[PDB]
């Protein structure tokens, strides 16, 4: 038995719903250490300790842009911290440092008896997500921290597109009609550069730069893929191999690629 498997056996319907099986609670981090602000989402009675995911917004943006991932991921068995950065103008490298500082504080809170997540986290199993410059920061986090178990940035941008060192399983959400971080100069070159990992490229048909943000029109598919990826690679949970690695064969997807990802 896989010691990290949590929750009921997945179905397409349960992964496409607005929330999974677990009840979610949240709190604001009182004294954030190394980043601007944080909200922690966590499940009640997930059946064991769970991995932690840190999510960072883009340039000029705040937690609201990426908030929907908190309850969505937490309700399937993850502790999620969404952050504001020290300044909304921080660059991707600074976003990566703040993302890792947020994970370090979640690990610290796991050992803090007064914290609602006391004893709820497996601090050896962490993942990174983020939008735009926060997506580039997530790739920087993966490159610099290969002990991370999964990355799933959305519409990523960085000055450099070369992430060939990344060995962390990485799902790239891309937005077909992005005019801010255009797919052909950002998300797709980033994806192509990664030769050392399990990876996936999922481009949302007709999507603008904000196509995976809170309030987007593809939460069923995007949330299914995000949860399935984190389940498969943070929990080593082979019940999610098909969901994580399959082509959706959906009109909502304009481009799908995957490598080293077996059904």
Three-class secondary structure of residue 57 per DSSP: coil
Q: Which residues contact 74 (CB under 8 A, 6 or more apart)?
A: 22, 24, 26, 41, 42, 43, 80
Three-class secondary structure of residue 186 per DSSP: coil
Residues forming the active site: 132, 178, 209
Strands laid side by side in the 24-28 sheet: 24-28, 37-43, 79-84, 50-56, 121-131, 150-154, 170-175, 199-204, 253-259
Asked whether residue 35 is marked as a ligand-binding residue, the answer is no
H runs (alpha helix) in 175-218: 187-193
Asked whether residue 229 is marked as a ligand-binding residue, the answer is no
Asked whether residue 68 is marked as a ligand-binding residue, the answer is no
**What are the φ and ψ backbone dihedral angles of 174, each rounded to 5 degrees?**
-125, 155
Q: What is each CA distance from 95 to 42, 107, 193, in whole angstroms? A: 23, 19, 21
Q: How was this structure determined?
A: X-ray
Resolution reading in Å: 1.6
Range 1-263: architecture per CATH: 3-Layer(aba) Sandwich (3.40)
Tokens 């990802």, located at residue? 261
3-state per-residue secondary structure call for 136-180: HHHHHHHHHCCCCCEEEEECCCCCCCCCCCCCCCEEEEEECCCCC
How buried is residue 180: exposed, middle or buried, by Cβ count under 10 Å (0-12/13-18/19+)?
middle
Residue ranges with strand state E in 57-134: 79-84, 121-131
**Do the Cβ atoms of 202 and 174 come closer than 8 Å?**
yes
How buried is residue 121: exposed, middle or buried, by Cβ count under 10 Å (0-12/13-18/19+)?
buried
Q: Where are the domains of the chain?
A: 1-263
């Amino acid at each position: 038995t896989n010691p990290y498997a949590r929750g009921p056996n997945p179905t397409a319907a349960s992964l496409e719903a607005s929330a999974g099986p677990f009840t979610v609670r949240s709190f604001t981090v009182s004294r954030p250490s190394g980043y601007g602000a944080g909200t922690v989402y966590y499940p009640t009675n997930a059946g064991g300790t769970v991995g932690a995911i840190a999510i960072v917004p883009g340039y000029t943006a705040r937690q609201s842009s990426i908030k929907w991932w908190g309850p969505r991921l937490a309700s399937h068995g993850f502790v999620v911290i969404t952050i504001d950065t020290n300044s909304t103008l921080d660059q991707p490298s600074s976003r990566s440092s703040q993302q890792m500082a947020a994970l370090r504080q979640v690990a610290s809170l796991n050992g803090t008896s007064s914290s609602p997540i006391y004893g709820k986290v497996d601090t050896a199993r962490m993942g990174v997500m983020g939008w735009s410059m926060g997506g580039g920061g997530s790739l920087i986090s993966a490159a610099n921290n290969p002990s991370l178990k999964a990355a799933a940035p959305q519409a990523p941008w960085d000055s450099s597109t070369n992430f060939s060192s990344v060995t962390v399983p990485t799902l790239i959400f891309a937005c077909e009609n992005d005019s801010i971080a255009p797919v052909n100069s950002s998300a797709l070159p980033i994806y192509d550069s990664m030769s050392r990992n399990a990876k996936q490229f999922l481009e949302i048909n007709g999507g603008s730069h904000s196509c995976a943000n809170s309030g987007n029109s593809n939460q069923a598919l995007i949330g299914k893929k995000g949860v399935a990826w984190m389940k498969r690679f943070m929990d080593n949970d082979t019940r999610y191999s098909t969901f994580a690695c399959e082509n959706p064969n959906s009109t909502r997807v304009s481009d799908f690629r995957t490598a080293n990802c077996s059904l």
